[PDB]
């Protein structure tokens, strides 16, 4: 295309706690990151004879 | 050729024909932005944009001297068949009327219901 | 979609009450001074040329010498080209100069 497009994809995110009996563990997190763009231009020259 | 053997004098052919111009480069100024497919007077070169330009920036302008379809005109005023067609830059519109404007074409087709008119751009001067 | 739509080559007009137009002759019809690709009646739809061409013609007033460079003005009321730069239409510059024939080979100009 003229103009690239961006590059998707997800990621979760946890950390291990200590865990003590009967307590509640703490849950995660899931976020998202995006690349970034690029485009094509356009060159030419010739001759007249 | 850096470093050659022997000081080989170099001839110019001249040339004049730089392109067909069809078509123009042009500087937006500060107070200036275009759309592509839309006309404009940017540098005292009137013709159509082909490319959208924001700011500051290359744009290219088309000066075929083609005929040229194109809403945006004064809808007031009746543009008959003929009549010599201007560009008000402080509106941006086509108009008729001859105070200050710049002349840049004259008009093929009559004004219809859409306010669409077929015109043929002029030599830019 | 494109503000271009054809190359301004040719463009149509419609005959008036008073207008009539013959094959591969010059005529101003509606501001367009150009050669027309029809025969035309009243209130028809002709095709005329703008082409910026070099054109051959022998219709004109034969009392002055066009000699190559003079600008060629078009006079409406008789019809004819001339040098004579009063009130009349300026259309070409001539190219070649007349001939015996009185033939004249001139560039058109843009309508301005």
């Given at each position: 295309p003229q103009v690239m497009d961006a590059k998707w994809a997800l990621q979760g995110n946890c950390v291990f706690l200590e865990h003590i009996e009967g307590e509640e563990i703490k849950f995660g997190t899931i976020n998202a990151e995006n690349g970034p763009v690029a485009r094509i231009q356009t060159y030419a020259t010739g001759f007249e004879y | 050729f850096k470093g050659q053997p022997t000081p080989s004098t170099i001839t110019q052919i001249t040339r004049a024909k730089?392109?067909?111009?069809k078509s123009v480069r042009v500087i937006l100024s500060e107070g200036e932005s275009t759309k592509t497919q839309q006309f404009y007077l940017i540098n005292g070169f009137f013709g159509v944009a082909m490319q959208d330009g924001e700011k500051g920036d290359e744009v290219t302008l088309q000066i075929e001297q083609a005929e040229y379809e194109t809403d945006n005109?004064?809808?007031s005023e009746a543009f008959e068949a003929g009549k010599l067609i201007y560009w008000d830059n402080t509106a941006k519109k086509f108009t008729?009327?001859?105070?200050?404007?710049?002349?840049v074409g004259r008009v093929?087709?009559?004004?219809d219901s859409n306010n669409v008119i077929w015109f043929i751009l002029l030599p830019q001067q």
């Amino acid at each position: 295309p003229q103009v690239m497009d961006a590059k998707w994809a997800l990621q979760g995110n946890c950390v291990f706690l200590e865990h003590i009996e009967g307590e509640e563990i703490k849950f995660g997190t899931i976020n998202a990151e995006n690349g970034p763009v690029a485009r094509i231009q356009t060159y030419a020259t010739g001759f007249e004879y | 050729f850096k470093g050659q053997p022997t000081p080989s004098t170099i001839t110019q052919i001249t040339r004049a024909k730089i392109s067909d111009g069809k078509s123009v480069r042009v500087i937006l100024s500060e107070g200036e932005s275009t759309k592509t497919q839309q006309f404009y007077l940017i540098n005292g070169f009137f013709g159509v944009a082909m490319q959208d330009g924001e700011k500051g920036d290359e744009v290219t302008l088309q000066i075929e001297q083609a005929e040229y379809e194109t809403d945006n005109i004064v809808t007031s005023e009746a543009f008959e068949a003929g009549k010599l067609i201007y560009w008000d830059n402080t509106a941006k519109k086509f108009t008729t009327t001859s105070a200050s404007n710049r002349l840049v074409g004259r008009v093929t087709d009559g004004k219809d219901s859409n306010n669409v008119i077929w015109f043929i751009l002029l030599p830019q001067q």
